[PDB]
Short mmCIF file of C-alpha atoms and ligand atoms in Angstrom, two decimals:
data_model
loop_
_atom_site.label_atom_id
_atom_site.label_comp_id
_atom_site.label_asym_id
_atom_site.label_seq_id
_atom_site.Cartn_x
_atom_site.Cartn_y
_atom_site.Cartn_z
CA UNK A 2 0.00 0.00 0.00
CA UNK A 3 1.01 3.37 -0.10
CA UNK A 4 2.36 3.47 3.78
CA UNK A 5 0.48 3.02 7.05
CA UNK A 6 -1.81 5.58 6.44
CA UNK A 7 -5.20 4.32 4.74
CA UNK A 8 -5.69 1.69 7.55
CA UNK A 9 -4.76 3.82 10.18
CA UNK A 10 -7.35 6.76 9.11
CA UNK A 11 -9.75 4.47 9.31
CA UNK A 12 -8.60 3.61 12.59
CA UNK A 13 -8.99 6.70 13.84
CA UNK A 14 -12.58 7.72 12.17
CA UNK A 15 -13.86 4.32 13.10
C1 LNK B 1 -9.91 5.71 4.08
C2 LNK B 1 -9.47 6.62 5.23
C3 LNK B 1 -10.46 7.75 5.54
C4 LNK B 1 -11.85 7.20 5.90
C5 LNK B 1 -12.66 8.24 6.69
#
């Protein structure tokens, strides 16, 4: 993926 970002946004929101 394009760094431990996507997932981690998610994360976050959810
Ligand atoms: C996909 C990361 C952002 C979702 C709210």
């Amino acid at each position: 993926r394009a760094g431990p970002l996507q997932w981690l946004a998610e994360k976050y929101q959810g």
